[PDB]
């Protein structure tokens, strides 16, 4: 536990673990910081997201290596048993992130940026669960991902400009959900295309810095559009 450690020391040690590429320790340090019960700053939200993205990222890429070896079909139980073990660790991490969001971070208080950030992340970790789920459990999980993304979209439409990097990232992840998870490629193409076009229109207001940040993400939308169309 991190209960005996100063919030400020937890944040410093999260930064040291990022520098050392110790992302499991970075995630434990950021979880301790969240359980102090104060709001995260923009910088702290990004540390929390980078730590858990790296941890689950490694697990999703392992799960897919093992799930491929498993699916090659023309046989001992070992591949299935190791795929199940990695799957259970991945589900463990997602439930930890989803418990932090529901218990500590998702509130009606705070700016649109924090409110959207946390509901997108909810939609994303439900999406990571949906990738490995089956049957009735998968259906529930897909519905939980959709409601979190939709609520994040409603706020971003009202309280952010169409070039906002958080709003673009959310719209990208939601199109990825439509395409990869909910078998809805039309809805995916429509959302990515609308999001691209609506953002194209506001680019002239942006300094060099925020121009780069918007266009980096707008390209990922166009690259998915190229692949889907």
């Amino acid at each position: 536990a991190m209960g005996s450690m100063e919030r400020a020391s937890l944040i410093q040690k999260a930064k040291l673990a990022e520098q050392a590429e110790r992302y499991e320790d970075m995630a434990a340090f950021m979880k301790g910081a969240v359980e102090k019960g104060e709001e995260l700053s923009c910088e702290e939200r990004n540390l929390l997201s980078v730590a858990y993205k790296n941890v689950v990222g490694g697990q999703r890429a392992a799960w897919r290596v093992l799930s491929s070896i498993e699916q090659k079909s023309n046989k001992g139980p070992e591949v299935r048993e190791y795929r199940e073990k990695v799957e259970t660790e991945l589900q463990g991490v997602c439930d930890t992130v989803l418990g932090l969001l529901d218990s500590h971070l998702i509130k009606e208080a705070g700016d649109a940026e924090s409110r959207v950030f946390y509901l997108k992340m909810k939609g994303d970790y439900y999406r990571y669960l949906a990738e490995v789920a089956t049957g009735d459990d998968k259906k529930r999980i897909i519905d939980s991902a959709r409601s979190a993304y939709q609520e994040a979209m409603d706020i971003s439409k009202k309280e952010m400009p169409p070039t906002n990097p958080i709003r673009l990232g959310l719209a990208l992840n939601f199109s990825v959900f439509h395409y990869e998870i909910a078998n809805s490629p039309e809805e995916a193409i429509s959302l990515a295309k609308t999001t691209f076009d609506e953002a194209m229109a506001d680019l002239h207001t942006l300094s060099e810095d925020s121009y780069k940040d918007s266009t980096l993400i707008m390209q990922l939308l166009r690259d998915n559009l190229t692949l889907w169309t």
């Binding site: 994303d124 990232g169 959310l170 992840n173 990922l220």
Partner: peptide, 9 residues
């Protein structure tokens, strides 16, 4: 090219 999602910068 496969489907890609938001990076963390």
């Amino acid at each position: 090219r496969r489907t890609i999602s938001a990076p963390v910068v």
